[PDB]
RNA sequence: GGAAAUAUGUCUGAAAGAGUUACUUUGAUAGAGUAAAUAAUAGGAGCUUAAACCCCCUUAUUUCCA
């Protein structure tokens, strides 16, 4: 690409070797243009500063310079480059940096000419869809625990079938599960989301529960897997949200609250889990009612913001009512016509009475199927 | 006229529930292009008129109470009120005002200067301007009623500026009789650059002990839309030493807005000047901002 | 010291007179509270002890003062010191134009009678009583002290009658001091300023705070014990005579 | 000049009051001799011409002073100046050990009534009368002057009652000056020394001659014309107020 | 009238002295201005007319005052009146604990020298010239008038040196009056309060306005013409002597 | 009581200062005599005891007073009282026509420097050390007494300079009392009359006996112990301030 | 970086209290009387109004990111 050529020119000017690294290299080897592009450079951060100053390309320090990570905007395109390093010690050698890598699937570094330089047979691992750790897998696990989750995500994303797990890897993960508790909860939450939105999610979740990672991560020891399995099947191909599946696994709202407090995830997901747990037990479609979607429509009308509309849509996804979910998508919350002024014209001044009458008219409007008109409501309004 | 019809439409829509029509506020509506912003103006305008109605009701109630008190006195008819044994006439308000005036004159002759620089007009809106004027009035009152009043200077005050006009309107004829020095010239001209200390909440220097041989300059500024560094910027431009109160040192400030109102600042400074310790001086900080005194 | 003396304190049942009586009795002297029968001086006289005795009399009444002084002589046998701390205060503007109100003459007359005429009557009668005594080593037969006011020097608005009475006391101080010089009696005046007493303490809290703030130093209403101590000092010193001491605290009354 | 001013002079039938009336009438003013009925003031008022009108009154009596002020208002239509020159003197020691004689209370009371109470009564009633005057250019509605001997400051033996009354006048001069300030009336006090007048002449002539010789300079008894001139100066000066001026001749009354 | 009098006025090139010279010269008298050579009083002397002559001199300098008096004698051959209206004012607290500032001794010494020592030097020197005069029929050879301040009685804060000087003038008023009484020279003191003059220029305008508002009546700064009129009245009256006249407008200075 | 107080007495070598020092030291206080080196005050300091020390100084000179105050602070650490009794008297007539002799300005200047300038210098210099003291109960840091004279009020012939100095002291009394009131220092003044001291003994014996007979009562010359007692009374009393006290004995100076 | 928190310009606080300024020479409750300022609570938006709330954007502080 043009940006790639500009980056090659800039780094040749710097004279320090550069190679795409990681997911970008994996995607290129897959034959798909990489969605994310990551570069590794032999240059030290001081050399990066010098060459950027001598180049004039606008600079971005995203706080990653602790590991040599910097961004430069060439032709309005941001290129992210990290200094090659070993486990922060910078290394110009590509083999040593690849050894520092976690998984072979990302160890290889591609030359800008299009030629790969793999030092641990990672490319063949990708071609075979197998997963191989850089050097000693157990040592890599010892290095970092969150990596367990990285390996799980890579397996779900890459491996074509479930159950293709290395027993050595599984036992090492089970042994090292103790360390996973210490790692920061954000990264845990991000990796969990990524795994959930991935393939083999049911099998991966079952394996994780078998590994007993939940106590270290704070997930409940016992979960309604069967319910989770049904929910996954229903939402399979329906863009499920990870919190939806987690709630399906969850049984009580307050456990989800504690899990959020541990992870410190956005309050939006907190509400997600809360009302999901509440409604899956409480709110259900009314087949006896002409419209089984009518209870959900009324509940949405009761709520304030369209966020509740999306929330009920996610609840429908959880329940698997694909037809009802579609109808909700096409269905739009009709506006309640009567305003407080109509009531004031009718001859009501007490504000609290106005609100009570508005609520009553809302229930009557819902009962009428929303077909009742504003003047019909006014006739319904009892002068007082 | 069109404003009148719009106000009637508001009454029908009952937002701000306008009740009475006035020429000045009507022409303000005509001038106030933004009706979205005007919603709050009309809301607190109607609140003002209600408050006037409630004031009339309360005045009726208080007149009834005064009639009750006077007829109670009439029925009691005790007579021999202290056997008519008084030593002074009941003219205490006048005597208090006169004593305050004498103290103010003495201070103006031999008082420690304290400067308010009204050079922030360009950084304030109408509401902020009114708040600044009210705070200045309160601060001047607190200084006046003290036992060791400051000699208050009003520097950078434009003769016809917005602040000057508002202050004159608020003080009526008292403005000319006030015992404070109001001058066009900036504080730098009046005093040597050495003695001036420009108080501000941004300066790295931390005020430790009140110094009686220094002129403390307080920025007569109200900053609703946070603009950090304005006072510090001015002090650096004039090359004037700056200080900040030790709010963290003696209070568990934690997360809060370090800015303090002018009246709180002057009360703290007066307490410090009167040999009060830092706890007594800082008591005047709003209680909400700080949890409690440190140790 | 003042032990063994006999003091006749007019208006001694309250305020400055009571403080002076308390101090003198504590020092061992004997006192006679010459205050109105309904003031409540009998309780104070009983409280002080056998030394203090209450004699109900009205200073404006010649017969009553004669009776009180005779009682004092009978119960103690001599009169060495006299204190005139009895008086009243009336506040009223001389003439108010807006209200069309004029100062009443009865108020002026009664204030004069109680303060100035009363003080002079007590002075003459007790001067006779003292002159009946025997001279001391220095010839001082006795001491007479009169309580004037700072209002006698700078009155406030509405203090016409009070100022007139206290100024009369101030003016007659020296002439009387010269009248009794052959006898050997020393006449002195004390002009207290603002003192915490029933006259002032009865005012609102804010008024008392303001008045206390007025005094340059100390910024507190003068304690009556200070007045009693000054009276004791005047008694002890055999040279003070015909002088007005301003026990004011440096306060000059405001306009 | 003082042309057109209307003056009410108490005790204007003799001595300093008569001298002031003479001077003010000669200057073109209009006087009202306010004196006792059997005082001979009628002859003087007739002598001085149309500008004088004798007003028989007693200062100690409220009704008489009110009647006199009504007469003055009817005759001249306004009152602009007041001069309290009416008073008496008494010579009696406070106590005389050799003679066993005590000052009578009646003499003291009468002297206070005439000198002090009468002066205050006239002052208040005249202030009420002058309140109706339209303010002049400077806002001065009127002027009040009071005579109060130097005995108020340095009295002599047997001068207790006089000194008391004159000290009362001196003390009340200021608070009244403050009371009437909003109205716009200037109150002043002249403290004469020794003068040639019937009051002094009542005493032995040899002692009067000695006292006249005792004045440092001039060594003669003050002429009442000097007092009248000083009164005119006080009236003219629009800034004198609330002060006691000693028209004494530098004499300090010896013991 | 004062036609033919010769007056030596110190500090007569500005303020009160200038007004006094104006009034006396307009009345018909002749005046000699005795002010500092740089005071620019020559223009004032030219403006007043031929009856006024400016004689440069410093009151503190004995030789300069002698030269000025000799010039006055040479021009007019007589000195009947002396007026001391030359002085300076210094505002400085005795000790300011907060600032750690102590009243300088040089300021106090200068203030005393200019006011008190200057006035006494002028008095003693002009005494000889006035004594040279043939005594008038009444007896007085001449009149000496001094200027003082109400600060001599109650000086506000930061007025120690000025109050000291004026209190010295007040104290020595009477001794000099007695000293010169045998030779027929009258000494009088005027104690003005506030008067619009260059002396008040030191104070801020707002302070001056407040003080003016605080005058009981008239509520304004006294005009110099009023002081000149009072001086003329003092000169005319042959009995005023050895007295301090508070031409203050009834204002009493609070702390 | 006065136990533990430190008093700096100026001119304590002899006269009133010596009597005050003797009384205060006998009461258990500590004194610092501050008189000229040739006054022989070191012998008196030795006689008084260990509590008293002699600091040779000239009150006119700032450096001398500073050295004396530093010595007092070093010896004791506090200055809780400052008595100003140093002073000199000169009897010289302002002008003597008969002998054609004029008061020399040098004598007047010297007298002012020694009395008035000296007292103010002592006040301003000792105010700092009094301020150093932390406030006690009631917020008092020190007490400054100044010895004026009755000549400030009624001076005699040939007493112009002395009267001027004492009148200046009296005039500056109150302004200093207001200046130091915030600091918490009470300023008082005592105006003794005729006191038997080395100053008087130089005068003729006939004059001394006539003066002793001239006092109304006691008909004698005041023993300095009476001053000392009055000074102690002023010290003890916490409310006396900004006042002049006449310890004269009802004597008014002869014309 | 994305989250997650708060923000009351006199103080408490949700409307009301304590506050503030200008005048009345106050007759003993002036402990009052005429007036002034008083903005649903950081600054601007939707939703509305009885109070409102609820959310969008902007700004000031804070704890967490191979
Ligand atoms: N209180 C002050 O601040 C103050 C200030 C200056 C002067 N004074 C004067 O000091 C004196 C002390 O009085 P006080 O302040 O203690 O007030 P007070 O009322 O407590 O004392 C006055 C006393 O005089 C008595 N009395 C009144 N009229 C009497 C009469 N006709 N015959 C006999 N006894 C009579 C009263 O019963 C009372 O005991 C008074 O004359 C007062 O005017 C007081
Ligand atoms: N004579 C002096 O040297 C001298 C000195 C100082 C003060 N004074 C005062 O000066 C004033 C003038 O006295 P004088 O020297 O002219 O003597 P005077 O006797 O001639 O004056 C007194 C006048 O007052 C009048 N009078 C007295 N009582 C009166 C009353 N009750 N009502 C009305 N009129 C009354 C008398 O009739 C007489 O006309 C007196 O008040 C006196 O005390 C006089
Ligand atoms: N200004 C007031 O209101 C006021 C009040 C009370 C007393 N006084 C006294 O009145 C007097 C007049 O002052 P003023 O108000 O006219 O102010 P002023 O400054 O106009 O008068 C002072 C005059 O004294 C002259 N002068 C100063 N030092 C002199 C010297 N050493 N030798 C000769 N002439 C000298 C000046 O040149 C000037 O003409 C002063 O003594 C002042 O203290 C003034
Ligand atoms: N003696 C009286 O009857 C009488 C009366 C009224 C006032 N006074 C005043 O009272 C004070 C006491 O004086 P006294 O009667 O004891 O006479 P005194 O001479 O005995 O005392 C005066 C003292 O002042 C000292 N002194 C003078 N100049 C001094 C200087 N420059 N520095 C230091 N010390 C200095 C002298 O050495 C002496 O000790 C004097 O100020 C006197 O003027 C005295
Ligand atoms: N914590 C603090 N330290 C010092 N001065 C402060 C302060 N809080 C308020 N002030 C003073 O009070 C004034 C009004 S506060 C306005 C602050 C505004 N940001 C500015 O630029 O100043 C400030 O200008 C400052 O003078
Ligand atoms: N816990 C971790 C986190 C990151 N890493 C490595 O650090 C690299 C930094 O993340 P990145 O997003 O830049 O990686 P790529 O996009 O270049 O693959 C990852 O690719 C991992 O190989 C690790 O090994 N262990």
XYZ file of N, CA, C and O in Angstrom, chain A residues 156-230:
300
model
N -10.152 -19.907 19.665
C -11.512 -19.710 19.196
C -11.563 -19.025 17.844
O -12.411 -19.343 17.007
N -10.654 -18.078 17.612
C -10.658 -17.317 16.372
C -10.103 -18.112 15.198
O -10.546 -17.917 14.061
N -9.146 -19.004 15.444
C -8.382 -19.644 14.386
C -8.765 -21.108 14.214
O -9.059 -21.545 13.100
N -8.761 -21.883 15.299
C -9.021 -23.313 15.190
C -10.394 -23.530 14.569
O -11.382 -22.893 14.959
N -10.458 -24.435 13.593
C -11.684 -24.643 12.836
C -12.722 -25.441 13.614
O -13.924 -25.272 13.379
N -12.292 -26.308 14.525
C -13.200 -27.179 15.253
C -12.915 -27.112 16.745
O -11.775 -26.876 17.156
N -13.928 -27.326 17.580
C -13.702 -27.349 19.026
C -13.029 -28.641 19.470
O -13.066 -29.667 18.788
N -12.402 -28.566 20.641
C -11.758 -29.715 21.239
C -10.358 -30.000 20.744
O -9.736 -30.958 21.219
N -9.838 -29.205 19.810
C -8.492 -29.415 19.292
C -7.464 -28.792 20.228
O -6.624 -27.997 19.796
N -7.513 -29.159 21.504
C -6.691 -28.539 22.533
C -5.541 -29.456 22.925
O -5.715 -30.672 23.053
N -4.369 -28.866 23.115
C -3.201 -29.621 23.547
C -3.344 -29.988 25.019
O -3.458 -29.087 25.860
N -3.334 -31.275 25.382
C -3.442 -31.616 26.811
C -2.357 -30.978 27.657
O -2.618 -30.582 28.799
N -1.137 -30.870 27.126
C -0.072 -30.190 27.856
C -0.457 -28.745 28.142
O -0.291 -28.253 29.264
N -0.977 -28.049 27.131
C -1.399 -26.669 27.331
C -2.506 -26.583 28.372
O -2.483 -25.708 29.243
N -3.479 -27.493 28.305
C -4.594 -27.457 29.245
C -4.116 -27.672 30.675
O -4.516 -26.948 31.593
N -3.262 -28.676 30.887
C -2.782 -28.949 32.237
C -1.911 -27.809 32.750
O -1.991 -27.442 33.929
N -1.073 -27.233 31.885
C -0.276 -26.085 32.301
C -1.171 -24.922 32.703
O -0.911 -24.244 33.704
N -2.231 -24.676 31.932
C -3.159 -23.600 32.264
C -3.819 -23.871 33.605
O -3.961 -22.970 34.440
N -4.252 -25.113 33.827
C -4.883 -25.449 35.096
C -3.925 -25.219 36.254
O -4.313 -24.684 37.299
N -2.663 -25.613 36.084
C -1.680 -25.415 37.143
C -1.441 -23.933 37.406
O -1.345 -23.507 38.562
N -1.343 -23.130 36.345
C -1.017 -21.717 36.489
C -2.225 -20.851 36.814
O -2.056 -19.649 37.048
N -3.432 -21.423 36.828
C -4.631 -20.646 37.127
C -4.479 -19.762 38.358
O -5.181 -18.752 38.473
N -3.584 -20.114 39.284
C -3.416 -19.302 40.484
C -2.986 -17.884 40.133
O -3.502 -16.912 40.697
N -2.045 -17.744 39.198
C -1.556 -16.425 38.840
C -2.600 -15.551 38.176
O -2.560 -14.325 38.311
N -3.545 -16.160 37.456
C -4.512 -15.375 36.694
C -5.292 -14.418 37.585
O -5.762 -13.378 37.111
N -5.443 -14.745 38.869
C -6.193 -13.869 39.762
C -5.523 -12.507 39.889
O -6.201 -11.473 39.927
N -4.190 -12.483 39.951
C -3.485 -11.232 40.168
C -3.636 -10.236 39.034
O -3.674 -9.026 39.272
N -3.719 -10.721 37.793
C -3.713 -9.823 36.646
C -4.870 -8.830 36.746
O -5.908 -9.100 37.364
N -4.685 -7.664 36.127
C -5.688 -6.611 36.189
C -6.987 -7.066 35.537
O -6.984 -7.804 34.549
N -8.109 -6.608 36.098
C -9.412 -7.044 35.633
C -9.822 -6.473 34.291
O -10.691 -7.045 33.629
N -9.254 -5.338 33.910
C -9.658 -4.839 32.584
C -9.266 -5.892 31.560
O -10.159 -6.486 30.925
N -7.965 -6.128 31.444
C -7.524 -7.051 30.405
C -8.333 -8.336 30.457
O -8.688 -8.903 29.416
N -8.635 -8.812 31.667
C -9.468 -10.000 31.814
C -10.804 -9.791 31.117
O -11.266 -10.639 30.348
N -11.445 -8.653 31.383
C -12.755 -8.382 30.805
C -12.677 -8.281 29.289
O -13.542 -8.805 28.577
N -11.649 -7.603 28.775
C -11.520 -7.446 27.329
C -11.342 -8.805 26.666
O -12.006 -9.126 25.670
N -10.445 -9.626 27.210
C -10.214 -10.945 26.636
C -11.462 -11.809 26.736
O -11.770 -12.576 25.818
N -12.188 -11.708 27.850
C -13.415 -12.479 28.001
C -14.439 -12.081 26.950
O -15.078 -12.943 26.338
N -14.610 -10.777 26.728
C -15.513 -10.321 25.678
C -15.093 -10.883 24.328
O -15.915 -11.426 23.578
N -13.803 -10.767 24.009
C -13.322 -11.222 22.712
C -13.566 -12.714 22.531
O -13.987 -13.158 21.457
N -13.310 -13.502 23.574
C -13.547 -14.940 23.496
C -15.031 -15.222 23.316
O -15.424 -16.078 22.516
N -15.879 -14.506 24.054
C -17.314 -14.743 23.970
C -17.835 -14.470 22.567
O -18.672 -15.219 22.051
N -17.351 -13.406 21.931
C -17.827 -13.049 20.598
C -17.202 -13.962 19.548
O -17.492 -13.833 18.354
N -16.345 -14.890 19.979
C -15.659 -15.776 19.062
C -16.414 -17.072 18.809
O -17.481 -17.333 19.361
N -15.827 -17.896 17.943
C -16.391 -19.192 17.605
C -16.038 -20.224 18.674
O -15.187 -19.999 19.540
N -16.707 -21.374 18.608
C -16.572 -22.423 19.615
C -16.816 -21.883 21.016
O -16.309 -22.437 21.997
N -17.591 -20.803 21.117
C -17.747 -20.112 22.390
C -18.313 -21.054 23.441
O -17.905 -21.022 24.606
N -19.265 -21.904 23.055
C -19.832 -22.847 24.011
C -18.772 -23.822 24.508
O -18.609 -24.020 25.719
N -18.037 -24.439 23.582
C -16.994 -25.378 23.976
C -15.914 -24.683 24.792
O -15.432 -25.227 25.792
N -15.513 -23.483 24.373
C -14.482 -22.756 25.103
C -14.942 -22.431 26.518
O -14.171 -22.558 27.474
N -16.195 -22.004 26.668
C -16.727 -21.685 27.988
C -16.760 -22.931 28.859
O -16.403 -22.892 30.044
N -17.206 -24.052 28.294
C -17.234 -25.290 29.062
C -15.832 -25.679 29.508
O -15.623 -26.070 30.662
N -14.856 -25.561 28.609
C -13.481 -25.886 28.965
C -12.966 -24.959 30.057
O -12.272 -25.400 30.980
N -13.289 -23.669 29.965
C -12.843 -22.718 30.977
C -13.430 -23.079 32.332
O -12.733 -23.069 33.354
N -14.722 -23.403 32.362
C -15.344 -23.813 33.614
C -14.687 -25.073 34.158
O -14.463 -25.196 35.368
N -14.363 -26.019 33.274
C -13.649 -27.215 33.707
C -12.312 -26.850 34.332
O -11.911 -27.429 35.349
N -11.611 -25.885 33.740
C -10.329 -25.436 34.264
C -10.459 -24.724 35.601
O -9.440 -24.481 36.253
N -11.677 -24.382 36.019
C -11.913 -23.717 37.295
C -11.297 -22.324 37.328
O -10.855 -21.855 38.379
N -11.248 -21.659 36.172
C -10.737 -20.297 36.123
C -11.717 -19.319 36.755
O -11.320 -18.218 37.158
N -12.989 -19.698 36.855
C -14.011 -18.800 37.389
C -13.676 -18.263 38.772
O -13.747 -17.039 38.966
N -13.313 -19.087 39.760
C -12.992 -18.522 41.081
C -11.896 -17.476 41.035
O -11.982 -16.462 41.739
N -10.861 -17.689 40.222
C -9.809 -16.687 40.108
C -10.324 -15.429 39.423
O -9.958 -14.312 39.807
N -11.174 -15.590 38.405
C -11.761 -14.438 37.726
C -12.989 -13.906 38.447
O -13.430 -12.784 38.157
N -13.542 -14.659 39.395
C -14.722 -14.237 40.115
C -16.031 -14.730 39.543
O -17.088 -14.431 40.113
N -16.002 -15.471 38.440
C -17.226 -16.033 37.898
C -17.822 -17.024 38.898
O -17.089 -17.671 39.653
N -19.147 -17.161 38.932
C -19.754 -18.119 39.864
C -19.278 -19.536 39.582
O -19.090 -19.932 38.430
N -19.082 -20.303 40.656
C -18.614 -21.676 40.503
C -19.613 -22.510 39.711
O -19.225 -23.300 38.843
N -20.901 -22.347 39.996
C -21.965 -23.077 39.322
C -22.690 -22.140 38.370
O -23.040 -21.016 38.746
N -22.911 -22.601 37.141
C -23.598 -21.813 36.130
C -24.588 -22.695 35.387
O -24.421 -23.915 35.308
N -25.624 -22.060 34.840
C -26.633 -22.762 34.050
C -26.106 -22.929 32.625
O -26.565 -22.300 31.668
N -25.107 -23.803 32.500
C -24.508 -24.065 31.197
C -25.579 -24.436 30.180
O -25.644 -23.862 29.088
N -26.442 -25.387 30.539
C -27.527 -25.791 29.651
C -28.322 -24.583 29.173
O -28.614 -24.449 27.979
N -28.678 -23.684 30.092
C -29.339 -22.452 29.682
C -28.417 -21.614 28.811
O -28.849 -21.035 27.807
N -27.138 -21.541 29.180
C -26.175 -20.831 28.349
C -26.061 -21.479 26.978
O -25.949 -20.785 25.963
N -26.067 -22.812 26.928
C -25.993 -23.498 25.643
C -27.204 -23.172 24.781
O -27.070 -22.892 23.583
N -28.398 -23.199 25.375
C -29.601 -22.850 24.627
C -29.527 -21.417 24.123
O -29.898 -21.132 22.979
